[PDB]
Amino acid sequence: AAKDVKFGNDARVKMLRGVNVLADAVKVTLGPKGRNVVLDKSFGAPTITKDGVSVAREIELEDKFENMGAQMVKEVASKANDAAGDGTTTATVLAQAIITEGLKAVAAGMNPMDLKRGIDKAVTAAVEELKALSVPCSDSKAIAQVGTISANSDETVGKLIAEAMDKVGKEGVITVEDGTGLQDELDVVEGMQFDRGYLSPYFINKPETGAVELESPFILLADKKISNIREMLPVLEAVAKAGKPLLIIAEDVEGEALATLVVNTMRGIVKVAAVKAPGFGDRRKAMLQDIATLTGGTVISEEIGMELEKATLEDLGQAKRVVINKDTTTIIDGVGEEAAIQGRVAQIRQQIEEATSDYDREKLQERVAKLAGGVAVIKVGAATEVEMKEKKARVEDALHATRAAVEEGVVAGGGVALIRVASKLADLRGQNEDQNVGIKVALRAMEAPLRQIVLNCGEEPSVVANTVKGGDGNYGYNAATEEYGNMIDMGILDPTKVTRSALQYAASVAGLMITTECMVTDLPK
Amino acid sequence: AAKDVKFGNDARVKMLRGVNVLADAVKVTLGPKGRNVVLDKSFGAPTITKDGVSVAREIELEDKFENMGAQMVKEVASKANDAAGDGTTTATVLAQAIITEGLKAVAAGMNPMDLKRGIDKAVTAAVEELKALSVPCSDSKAIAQVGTISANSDETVGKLIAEAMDKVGKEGVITVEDGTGLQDELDVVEGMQFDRGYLSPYFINKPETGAVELESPFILLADKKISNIREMLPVLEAVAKAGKPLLIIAEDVEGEALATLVVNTMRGIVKVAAVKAPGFGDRRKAMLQDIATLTGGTVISEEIGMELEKATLEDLGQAKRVVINKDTTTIIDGVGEEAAIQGRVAQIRQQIEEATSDYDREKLQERVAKLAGGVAVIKVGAATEVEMKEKKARVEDALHATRAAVEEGVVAGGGVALIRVASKLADLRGQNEDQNVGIKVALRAMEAPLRQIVLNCGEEPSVVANTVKGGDGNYGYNAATEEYGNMIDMGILDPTKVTRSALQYAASVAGLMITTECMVTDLPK
Amino acid sequence: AAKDVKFGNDARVKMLRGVNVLADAVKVTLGPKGRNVVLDKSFGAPTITKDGVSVAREIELEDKFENMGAQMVKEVASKANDAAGDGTTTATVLAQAIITEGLKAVAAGMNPMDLKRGIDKAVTAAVEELKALSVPCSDSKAIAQVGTISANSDETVGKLIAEAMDKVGKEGVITVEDGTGLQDELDVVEGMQFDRGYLSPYFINKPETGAVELESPFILLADKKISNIREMLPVLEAVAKAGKPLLIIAEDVEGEALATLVVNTMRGIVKVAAVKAPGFGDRRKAMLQDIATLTGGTVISEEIGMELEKATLEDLGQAKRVVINKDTTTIIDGVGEEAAIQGRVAQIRQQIEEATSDYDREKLQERVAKLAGGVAVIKVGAATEVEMKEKKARVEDALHATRAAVEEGVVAGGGVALIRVASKLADLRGQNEDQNVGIKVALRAMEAPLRQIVLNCGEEPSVVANTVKGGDGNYGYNAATEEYGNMIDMGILDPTKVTRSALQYAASVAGLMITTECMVTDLPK
Structure with missing residues (x-):
């Protein structure tokens, strides 16, 4: 059918509005103190969830242009989730921050291609900085630690992941199923x-x-x-x-x-x-x-x-x-x-x-x-079927996080790794003024996740951000306990891979949308 | 059914608005620094592209008259694509410039037929001047060069095109497929x-x-x-x-x-x-x-x-x-x-x-x-299937560009060849004032592609255009590096055939378009 | 009566629209090729003028906020006129450029006070650079030259100004009069x-x-x-x-x-x-x-x-x-x-x-x-009353320009002095990014007068601006003859004082305006 075309900055602001809606919807749930969000089931009672992935698939706006913006941000965030296993919320928040700042700068008559190049330089510098700040997780003890942390602080599942990890080697395959007995069963079958x-x-x-x-x-x-x-x-x-x-x-x-x-x-x-x-x-x-x-x-x-x-x-x-x-x-x-x-x-x-x-x-x-390696088999063990399902889900997500950590590493969680690399990269300069402005946009946009987490905690975002930036190493702000200190010590950890992928894909979609003028769109009927 | 008809300058402005919409949509993506554009998709995430052919394919306007103008320009651009293999964006930009200037002059009370005749004289003079400015590409070395630069500066694909070119002679047949191994395979089968x-x-x-x-x-x-x-x-x-x-x-x-x-x-x-x-x-x-x-x-x-x-x-x-x-x-x-x-x-x-x-x-x-010549067979060789697809596409477009170059020749790319032809034909005169005005319209409209490329790069269009016109030969402005020099040395080359066909088809559609009065179409329901 | 306020960026855009209207109305007439502009007269025929002062006098907008913006710019321009005797149009154009760029930057979440400080630093550097580029006008020959060129290239009036200047010394007083005879008269009275x-x-x-x-x-x-x-x-x-x-x-x-x-x-x-x-x-x-x-x-x-x-x-x-x-x-x-x-x-x-x-x-x-010096009186002499009045006005503006030149100096006219200062101050840096952005805003805003003059001439503005910036010294672009060269040689000169005052007052109003939020006004009734 016919296709309404809108090009210029009006398209940019509509797309920004869509990204704003989706980013709010997702970022509400960010952090350990993440606030709940209510979906709509076609029938019966609505479901309530703090999961960014579950809520994200729902939003798709009424008016088509901002729907497109939200849809592509959602698609890139889902790509980030598929790549590693988490970080949809972080990717969405980063995309929203970068896009707000970048479109604000573009409205000031600034060369968008230079903004994209500067953002790309900043994000690759941040990625290599994260790789520098990564902590190896090859030893079985850290593997058990990350398994415990991922599954809401349960030592048994982390232990089980450790034995399966030992069984099928470094790059082994691990699958999870349901076990009859309360005891957990592990065995290797080709x-x-x-x-x-x-x-x-x-x-x-x-x-x-x-x-x-x-x-x-x-x-x-x-x-x-x-x-x-x-x-x-x-x-x-x-x-x-x-x-x-x-x-x-x-x-x-x-x-x-x-x-x-x-x-x-x-x-x-x-x-x-x-x-x-x-x-x-x-x-x-x-x-x-x-x-x-x-x-x-x-x-x-x-x-x-x-x-x-x-x-x-x-x-x-x-x-x-x-x-x-x-x-x-x-x-x-x-x-x-x-x-x-x-x-x-x-x-x-x-x-x-x-x-x-x-x-x-x-x-x-x-x-x-x-x-020859075969496939490890892990069978969940408990008394009731409710705990079957929930512990199976916990084992699933813990296994995803643990393999992601093993592949690349593990950095401080809670979004402070981004803050640390941002502080480390405070003097990164581009080829000209526009690339420098884009670099600064990326640098100040990587602070969005910690600020949002603190805001969900109810404390002052900027105060905590400044306090974290003052420190060096992995010193950060525990959101749950509202206490400062080395995040690795208190166990708040995120795989290096998930943070790297989320940041990279957020930067990719941000650069890919900052440089768009035209939008072809079906007529609103 | 019933059909609404509109004739006079109101039809002309309707047509101009439609062509303006289509031309903006396409020209946004022109040049190495071309800005992205998002497209429709009834389901799932919208696609993002810089290829103007897809953008043109996905354009049709709500109002019937704008739709007919956009559709006829799009059809002529598609004909230009089929003739050579590229240059849809260039043809659309040239058509937009010529249409704007010519319809403006027609609204200025001038004989449209004389404008068409002057434009035709100017464009045939431009075509013969371009043929004079063409550089032969008969030798295998230039064939490899054009193949390399066409496929985003990949020497291997240009090399392979060179050997296949040698195998099946000057007017041979080239086909591309998928090879099992990482090595590229070439063989001739009847x-x-x-x-x-x-x-x-x-x-x-x-x-x-x-x-x-x-x-x-x-x-x-x-x-x-x-x-x-x-x-x-x-x-x-x-x-x-x-x-x-x-x-x-x-x-x-x-x-x-x-x-x-x-x-x-x-x-x-x-x-x-x-x-x-x-x-x-x-x-x-x-x-x-x-x-x-x-x-x-x-x-x-x-x-x-x-x-x-x-x-x-x-x-x-x-x-x-x-x-x-x-x-x-x-x-x-x-x-x-x-x-x-x-x-x-x-x-x-x-x-x-x-x-x-x-x-x-x-x-x-x-x-x-x-x-007796048979058909050359080229099988793409690499590891991943994703790179199978992308390198197959690269081989396809490089083959199209290389055969176009072999058929006619190769001129300076980046839109500077048209600028050189314009500077060469600054003194071309028609039989009367109207034909002269049409000639000037065509001459100043041939500068549109370089101006649009520079505008996409964010630099000043007219300064670059004047600097290029000052020089002689193939000297011009490299868009990617933002450095002046010679296109032949910098490997920014376009086939003579594609530029000639795009310019000729833009002139043909413009001449057809200017000399229209009536627009019959179905009622808007 | 009751008063409504409006603060934030909505106030800034209202002011921007008002100053845009006034600046368009004034800037149309800028330059030797300045386009005429008709005024209103409640009775009788309208009056057509090229003098920007007259145009700015009648400008006042319907909406209250736009009216405030226009009135602020107009008042500052009138102050510039009173200070030196000309340059209202230049001051208004500079103010419009600076305000457009500055409010665009402020919309990008940039500290307005740092912008004001950077603009102030840039204009101070520009003023001292302009003083460095000033050419003395102490000798009687240059006095005659400036008087001649000021009065539309009439040597007699410049000569008369020269003799009067000699009579009453460098800081003397000169007053016009209507002399009975065709011969020009001069006398010295207490x-x-x-x-x-x-x-x-x-x-x-x-x-x-x-x-x-x-x-x-x-x-x-x-x-x-x-x-x-x-x-x-x-x-x-x-x-x-x-x-x-x-x-x-x-x-x-x-x-x-x-x-x-x-x-x-x-x-x-x-x-x-x-x-x-x-x-x-x-x-x-x-x-x-x-x-x-x-x-x-x-x-x-x-x-x-x-x-x-x-x-x-x-x-x-x-x-x-x-x-x-x-x-x-x-x-x-x-x-x-x-x-x-x-x-x-x-x-x-x-x-x-x-x-x-x-x-x-x-x-x-x-x-x-x-x-003791007294007041010298110069009496205009001609045959007809009409030429008496026009030559009296020529004597007025000529002696105003001559005394302005004697006070400070004379730089290249036609707006190229600001271009030269801008090129000289290309590397000026502020204390931080915001002040630097403000400095760049001011620098690129000082090019507005020459660009507008060229646009009124019908030629390409940016090409001429780039060509002028390429040169050094006083090598500008003659607007009247459309030929490059040295302004001093061809007698296109402006007093240093008028340019300095216009630029300074434009910067002052721009600083006072960029940092404005609240607009308290009477309700529209």
């Missing part, structure tokens, strides 16, 4: 982990997790793109008779094919979910063969000759359980014989020995690593 | 390319490319029009059972058959692409025989006697991959035996020997050229 | 001048000059305030019988007395002008005795004993002609005997000999100087 996302969000059987958990699902290996529904109709009938969930790994899925699969899942006849083919080319085929070895399945490739129509239940693989995250996959306890898997590992090891190319050697090494 | 477009846009399986990529498709050769789908039923059943893509080269395809094939493609049971049969008469039949030789198919003609109902899978040809551009096609690695192709080449060579007409001789010579 | 303005603007018998010219008036010397009109009744009757004008010098004039004299001028039975008594205390009494000596009058003081009621026509002084400027007075050819004046000069000379205080010695020396 299983896969590759980074691919579901074809459609509608496959999500558990929307509150955003994942597809299947119990004893058959698996179909395909090196070919599924084009016609007739190709996998016989296996669809076979699995429907079997009355079990299905998993489809294929080179590609066409639009009509995935539409038909979505319709079938809505029918509920078969609990089938599909995911893209990982790997690439020959590497893709080799690791598909690895999956077949693991699950006892068989790869169906056009080049070899067989077709999906000639698919039997025996030809398919199987596993005890699988989970399809947003951009991750997990296979647990493949049926395939361990001796065959060890033989495949030996074959790939010989390939490593004869490997001459460096990147192919890296691919083979990580392939054998994921093939 | 193929084809003829200038024909898809019957409808709906065949586009990949809208972001505007093409129809099919893997291992069967081809049906037909010298007749597709009047009834009954003839298409047996082959459709055969290809549905085969479960492979289909291609249809026919003399014509009626609208009802087009609707049937559109419905079939939307169903997804069978994917099929149709395209007009090029050549003409006897030449058309001869090149269809060539296609049959290459693909191992058979030509089905009413005159010979066989009908499309009596068509088997063996009768159809086959190839490893095909792509249907907007107005072009490509066939890669025809199954047909190379000895048969060589025999056909020898037959057409004898036809060349006995050829008497110069035109028939040229047709036969280009026929043997396109038959 | 006169007087002191810096005092009329009590009421209503005394102005010639509003287009803003002065009070009286022929053969009877001066009355008084050392007392005119509390009651009864004291003025006998002298008023005497002068009514005499049927001649009169002058009144008194210690002070009360509101009732001046209201009564305004009534008596509206009746105009007596031609009366009253001016505040100059001098101070004993110095005032001594110089009033000097006035009595010059005019043959007598000082009437309460302390001595005589009263204003016991005043005869003989007691009053007399002179051939007097003129009361806005803030100055002139008395020409006092009737008093020259021998008595010489004796008084000698007496004050022996007072100088015994004068031990430095400032008292200065007062006595300037007193004898103004007593």
Whole structure:
């Protein structure tokens, strides 16, 4: 239909209004003293939550332009959350501060491209400063500490994360499930982990997790793109008779094919979910063969000759359980014989020995690593199902935070790491006046999270900010206890990775929006 | 239904407002320092882009008259894109400048036809002056240079374009695909390319490319029009059972058959692409025989006697991959035996020997050229799939720019070539005062692109324009570094063909536009 | 009546709109190619003028806040005019530029007081740099040159100013007159001048000059305030019988007395002008005795004993002609005997000999100087009354410019002196970022006059500004001839004093205005 176009500073102020609305809605909940926010369920009582991620997905304004601004800020914040596992609120607050200041400066006839360049310089300097200020978390003791801190100060979950961490090594895979007994159970079972996302969000059987958990699902290996529904109709009938969930790994899925699969899942006849083919080319085929070895399945490739129509239940693989995250996959306890898997590992090891190319050697090494390391299994243990659910969620978020900390490090939490890098970078200068102004905008905008936390605590924001900036190291302001001191000592910690990613994505979206004039928009009807 | 008509200068100002909206929307993104622009999306986050083609595609105004003005300018800009491969933003900016000045002069009580004649004289003089200012790009070194600078200064892609260029000669065919390994692969396989477009846009399986990529498709050769789908039923059943893509080269395809094939493609049971049969008469039949030789198919003609109902899978040809551009096609690695192709080449060579007409001789010579030259195949090589996609896009645009440069030449980029032509043609005079005023309008409107680029950079436009006009040769203003110098030395180059086509099409649409009075359109409801 | 206020940035934008209206109205007429502007006349035809003073006189806006902004700028510009004699348009343009930029910066959350301090520092540096760039005008040849160019390039009037300047010395007094013959006349008579303005603007018998010219008036010397009109009744009757004008010098004039004299001028039975008594205390009494000596009058003081009621026509002084400027007075050819004046000069000379205080010695020396030097009178000579009036106006503005140049100096005109100062002060830095931004605002605002002059000429402003900044010395851009070169050589000159005063007053009003929040005003009814 027709499209109203608004360009100039009117577009900028409308977009700023949208970002202001979304940023207020999110920043209210920031901090340990974060205030509650009430959503609206279509039916029944409204839900009340302090979670920035849950509230953020709800807001989308009425008038279209500010809706666009809010939507893209929300999308970048969600990208930040997916990258690390937290920091949606921090990213949104940083984006709001940077954008308010930057658009205020742009309204003063200042070169927006220079503002973007200065902000980029400031944020990269802040990122390397954070890396300098990072504290290693390789030792198991700090791993237990961060696990405890993430899960609302519970030592048992941090301990469990520590033993699983030891079991599956530094870059291991850890999955969480429900255990029958009150005691927590840990064991390692051979299983896969590759980074691919579901074809459609509608496959999500558990929307509150955003994942597809299947119990004893058959698996179909395909090196070919599924084009016609007739190709996998016989296996669809076979699995429907079997009355079990299905998993489809294929080179590609066409639009009509995935539409038909979505319709079938809505029918509920078969609990089938599909995911893209990982790997690439020959590497893709080799690791598909690895999956077949693991699950006892068989790869169906056009080049070899067989077709999906000639698919039997025996030809398919199987596993005890699988989970399809947003951009991750997990296979647990493949049926395939361990001796065959060890033989495949030996074959790939010989390939490593004869490997001459460096990147192919890296691919083979990580392939054998994921093939032999397996998948850690953590089973939550308590008395009541309410504590099952809440402790499972706590274990989930603690595991995310702990792996993020292990990957990069851990800095002082509560938003004071940003304050520290800002104070460290007080003399950073750009190539000219405009870049310098952008640098100063970024520097004074990185103070927004601590100021908002203090404001939620009810104390004076600027006083606490000045007191923190006066100190050096990791000295900061405990929001919960309202006492000063070394944040690491009192346990308030955030992974270096989450803060770095949140700041980087906030700066990226800020620079990407500061330099926009035109907006095409559907007519308000 | 009823149609509101508006004529006189009120129609002209309506048209000017529409063109102003579209031109602002597009020109905001012009130049290396081009400002971003956010676009519509009915669902999810809005997309952010600096490519003016998408912005133009996503523009249409609420008011009907503004909409018609914007739409005709957009159509001419799209024609400019199709001609060369770039320069939509430049064409739109030139059109906006010429339209503003010319409509202003027409409102100043001046003969519009004389303005059009003066603009045409000025633009043809500019075109020949630009051809004089062109720099040849025949040598492989300049080919590598243009390929490198086109793809954001990547030497590897320009190099690869250079080797493919050497492989398939001056007027060879270049195609891009995805390579399994990190190394780039190049090889020549007998193929084809003829200038024909898809019957409808709906065949586009990949809208972001505007093409129809099919893997291992069967081809049906037909010298007749597709009047009834009954003839298409047996082959459709055969290809549905085969479960492979289909291609249809026919003399014509009626609208009802087009609707049937559109419905079939939307169903997804069978994917099929149709395209007009090029050549003409006897030449058309001869090149269809060539296609049959290459693909191992058979030509089905009413005159010979066989009908499309009596068509088997063996009768159809086959190839490893095909792509249907907007107005072009490509066939890669025809199954047909190379000895048969060589025999056909020898037959057409004898036809060349006995050829008497110069035109028939040229047709036969280009026929043997396109038959024996084959098709170059370039496979992108890297690790990640994300970089597969981005480097494939870079290779595509670099190939387009490189072939455009080879066809005609390469001039100073950054919009300074138009400034140089303007300075060279400062004394061009028409037959009378009105033609002279039109000439001056065109001359001062050719400065719009550089002025807009400088304005996007934040510097003073007119100062830079005057400084550039002062110099001679290719001296100008580097936008990225903000340093004066020579564009040839600084690697900021644009093909002569794209600039010439953009300027010519802007002049053509401006001449058409100025000489309009009446605007018939449907009532606003 | 009730009053409404408005504070914050809304007040600033209201003031910005008002000053924008006034600045547009004034700046249109700037430069030699200044565009005309029509005025309003309640009766008869409108008057078309290029003089910015006249245009600014009638400007007052509908909205109260815009009216305040316009009135503040207009009052400061009028102060600039009174200080030097020209440069109202330059002051208004500078104020508009500085205010636009400063309020734009203040909207960016920037400390207004630091902006004021930075602007003050920048303008002080500019003033001292301008003094450094000043060219002396002491020699008679340069005096003739400035007089010639001031009066639209008429050598005769500049010559006449030169001879008068020689007659009455460097700090002499010169007064215009209408000479009967076509030949220009010059004479030296015993006169007087002191810096005092009329009590009421209503005394102005010639509003287009803003002065009070009286022929053969009877001066009355008084050392007392005119509390009651009864004291003025006998002298008023005497002068009514005499049927001649009169002058009144008194210690002070009360509101009732001046209201009564305004009534008596509206009746105009007596031609009366009253001016505040100059001098101070004993110095005032001594110089009033000097006035009595010059005019043959007598000082009437309460302390001595005589009263204003016991005043005869003989007691009053007399002179051939007097003129009361806005803030100055002139008395020409006092009737008093020259021998008595010489004796008084000698007496004050022996007072100088015994004068031990430095400032008292200065007062006595300037007193004898103004007593002995007298007033020179230049009489314009032509054939027609119309050319008499226009040449009289030319003599007025020419001698104003000449005395301004003699006082301080002469710099390059056409607004290029400010450009040169700006280029010289490109590296001036403040104490912090805010003061630096204010400094840059002032520096880029000093380019406004030349830019507006070029824009009125129809050429490109910024190109000319850049070309001028590139040069050094006095190399500017001739607006009239549109040729570059040295302003001094081509006689486009402005006094250093007028440029300095205009810039200083523009900076002062800009500082007073940027730091304004509250606007208390009467309600719009």
